[PDB]
Design a binder for this molecule. Structure first.
Ligand SMILES: *CCC(=O)Nc1ccc(/C=C/c2cc(C)c(O)c(C)c2)cc1
Ligand SMILES: *CCC(=O)Nc1ccc(/C=C/c2cc(C)c(O)c(C)c2)cc1
Lengths: 116, 116, 115, 115
């Protein structure tokens, strides 16, 4: 609910399924602490990463494992991953959708931020 | 259901609401016949354009009225519209999502095609 | 060179070479009249489409033949073409670059308008 | 010029000027070591980051300071930065252009790798 990730494949015209996603949160000492992880579903979506209680203010990194996705499909892509880094919840709780559209040598990403 | 259009705003980080969309289908005489139209909802989505019976094989044009969207928000954009032209249903019925991500001087578009 | 077109390939990480591009100007009767055309170069670019004298204010359409490009690479694409339709306005910078980044089921386009 | 970075602005239709870019190379201990940096030019480009001799195979990260760019324009952005992380491979073409197209809540990036 408060953080969702959607991944699409621009080659196939389909959801990007079984894409690994790791989320980190910047700690007080400036290191990236593991926060949540999961894999996209057959709809290219990953829900259930966190709760509104746990998803406090901070700087978050959403790392989408695009290389493995191309690798597990047998293809050699350019990027290691796609990383999305942003401050969240700093004016109170919001809901965030992080969307990515993937090609072997390119990607686009956007955020949809809503106030419930 | 068989044709859906989703429009996002890359400036606001939000759905693009109240965006006019016109769909045309190429006729036998090579003119563009009006096929369906509507406006995106508060979720940036437009459903209910057509039915699987009416959505036959053909070449379709999805014209997204991006200029008015920037104009109705009081902004002067580059493009007149974003047009998406594609052959549909030529190997049998499919479901099509046409997605667009808008900026004042740029847009991206993708398709998600699924076989029910 | 008031109008340039740049086409890139997101699958191969390269310029999109030998892509047909047609430019049209909207006529008084609302039909699209051919204006200029060419094929992208080895660097994915098409220069020399028009001159300052001919490129007056108006609505233009740049049609990029993406379907033929993908088919020549043996890849099944979604779109018939990519269309970029815009107004040229003299109350803006003078040089327009229309850039497109192509994938089989997606494209991105931007304008770089400079003085 | 084996590595070039190009940054474009999707709101204004222009090069993204005076954007800070930092390049890092992944070290043996898995930390990111500074490699090269600069600010984009009036044409949105940053050349002269490295030489052929120094740009060996490896994993590189190009960090584009998008947040400062938007803030200088008085626009509230979403991302802290844009990150492009990739492997340089000698069994590929020799010149890498990393391009980024920026909006306040979105960015696109591509690689153009040529000989
Ligand atoms: C409305 C559908 C939904 O519930 N969630 C959802 C739909 C679509 C997206 C993102 C689509 C998209 C399209 C394009 C062209 C680009 O470039 C990007 C990055 C994302 C997200 C969420
Ligand atoms: C032709 C020499 C050169 O490298 N010039 C150059 C022009 C443009 C780019 C990238 C453009 C671009 C366009 C779009 C629509 C997207 O999404 C991206 C990421 C980049 C590179 C180089």
């Amino acid at each position: 609910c408060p953080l969702m990730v959607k991944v699409l494949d621009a080659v196939r015209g389909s959801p990007a399924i079984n894409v690994a996603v790791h989320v980190f949160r910047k700690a007080a000492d400036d290191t990236w602490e593991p926060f949540a992880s999961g894999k996209t579903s057959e709809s290219g979506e990953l829900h259930g990463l966190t709760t509104e209680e746990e998803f406090v203010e901070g700087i978050y990194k959403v790392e989408i494992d695009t290389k493995s996705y191309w690798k597990a499909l047998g293809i050699s892509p350019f990027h290691e991953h796609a990383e999305v880094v942003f401050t969240a919840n700093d004016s109170g709780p919001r809901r965030y959708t992080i969307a990515a559209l993937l090609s072997p040598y390119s990607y686009s990403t956007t955020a949809v931020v809503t106030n419930p």
